[PDB]
């Protein structure tokens, strides 16, 4: 058995978007699939289930006519058709196979990536983060690496070539005002800052970037 | 629709312990034909949920028998003997009664261990980010533990909140502490016009707040 989903799917709001459910390994149209919407906050919501011999169809009293499913039996595929979409729905879905009142949910996806949004694919904005002139020097001091304004994730903010990886901070995105904005730090002596070199580098494969960018003390 | 009510929300506890997490219904979720039917799932962070207990009185082909399902008509208990490292993920309740199906609240699970001291650190923006034209104040928080504290932002004296980022990650593997990042984003004008900011940091293991404060004229 096997389940495959769509890729990532980006649309201004109000529009429709389509995902696809490929399932092999069984009889495809012989029992219920069942969909689940996870907030990337928190808590699981379902939005439905169908069969895809006959035209049964259920919706949660919450969702309902915000999607309307559709089923093929020539092939293996099952789609569903979404309503006026808001910027409250932006989240993770799975699909999955489920046979009521007896042995169900032994399998699932992989995961499907939906990001409604307005903004505009912009490359990254790097900035080291230098302590301020007036320090005392302590037996260790930590550092930073900023990225401002990128457009849509993921991006890999990584010290030189994994020489520094112990004791590395890596946080979720949140947005400020329209756009993200993530930093990294580390833990180093105090007696190597002074002589050893460190380049902060940003990859972004969305837009291709590749940008390393040094960090001095003032 | 019958809603799940799980308690606790974070039930911590250390390596080789006994855990019990309680699943109430909202109604009787008993099948006339003598049987109740609820599964139990266990998602980890970046993975697709697994299974572990179908049919409570029964348990899952492939899972080991460390995991236990219990209760009566309505109460029901899922227990752990010996939690290990890789039993750490989200818990999560399913209703298999009436139609439609409906998932539970979601408990959160990870282990416990010892109080740890918080490091703060504070980065005034570099001279790129002047020459760009902003100010991005960063405040660092690492290898700290619990998750109770707080972060304020003192400007001159004065608590500021408009442009405050926090972020935290998971509990990590390694040291099993936690992490947080405090942004403040302002304008360069901004940035010549006061004197003094400040990160402060309120947490249990800390009788008075670590303060990390920097003057712009110095």
């Known amino acids: 058995v096997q389940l495959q989903q769509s890729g990532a799917e980006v649309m201004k709001p109000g529009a429709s978007v389509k995902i696809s459910c490929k399932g092999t390994?069984?009889?495809?149209?012989?029992?219920?699939i069942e969909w689940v919407k996870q907030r990337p906050g928190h808590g699981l919501e379902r939005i439905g289930e169908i069969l895809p011999g006959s035209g049964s169809t259920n919706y949660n009293e919450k969702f309902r006519g915000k999607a309307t499913f559709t089923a093929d039996k020539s092939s293996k595929t099952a789609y569903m058709q979404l309503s006026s979409l808001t910027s409250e729905d932006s989240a993770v879905y799975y699909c999955?196979?489920?046979?009521?009142?007896?042995?169900?949910?032994?399998?699932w996806g992989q995961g499907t990536s939906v990001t409604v949004s307005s903004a505009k694919t912009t490359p990254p904005s790097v900035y080291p983060l230098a302590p301020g002139s007036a320090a005392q020097t302590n037996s260790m001091v930590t550092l930073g690496c900023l990225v401002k304004g990128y457009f849509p994730e993921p991006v890999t903010v990584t010290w030189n070539s994994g020489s520094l990886s112990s004791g590395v901070h890596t946080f979720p995105a949140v947005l400020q005002s329209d756009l993200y904005t993530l930093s990294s730090s580390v833990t180093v002596p105090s007696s190597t800052w002074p002589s050893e070199t460190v380049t902060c580098n940003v990859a972004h494969p969305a837009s291709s970037t590749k940008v390393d960018k040094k960090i001095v003390p003032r | 629709d019958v809603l799940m009510t799980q308690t606790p929300l974070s039930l911590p506890v250390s390596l080789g312990d006994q855990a019990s997490i309680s699943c109430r219904s909202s109604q009787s979720i008993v099948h006339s034909n003598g049987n109740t039917y609820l599964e139990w799932y266990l998602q980890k962070p970046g993975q697709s949920p697994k299974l572990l207990i179908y049919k409570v009185s029964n348990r899952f082909s492939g899972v080991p028998d460390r995991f236990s399902g219990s209760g009566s008509g309505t109460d029901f208990t899922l227990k752990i003997s010996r939690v290990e490292a890789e039993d750490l993920g989200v818990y999560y309740c399913?209703?298999?009664?009436?139609?439609?199906?409906?998932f539970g609240g979601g408990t959160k699970l990870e282990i416990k261990r010892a109080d740890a001291a918080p490091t703060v650190s504070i980065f005034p923006p570099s001279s790129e980010q002047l020459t760009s034209g902003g100010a991005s104040v960063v405040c660092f928080l690492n290898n700290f533990y619990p998750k109770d504290i707080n972060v304020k932002w003192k400007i001159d004296g004065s608590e500021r909140q408009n442009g405050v980022l926090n972020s935290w990650t998971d509990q990590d593997s390694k040291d099993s502490t936690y992490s947080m990042s405090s942004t403040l984003t302002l304008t360069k004008d901004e940035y010549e016009r006061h004197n003094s900011y400040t990160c402060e940091a309120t947490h249990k293991t800390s009788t008075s707040p670590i303060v990390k404060s920097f003057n712009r004229n110095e």
């Open positions: 390994g069984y009889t495809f149209s012989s029992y219920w």
């Open positions: 399913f209703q298999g009664s009436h139609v439609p199906w409906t």
């Open positions: 999955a196979r489920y046979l009521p009142y007896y042995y169900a949910m032994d399998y």
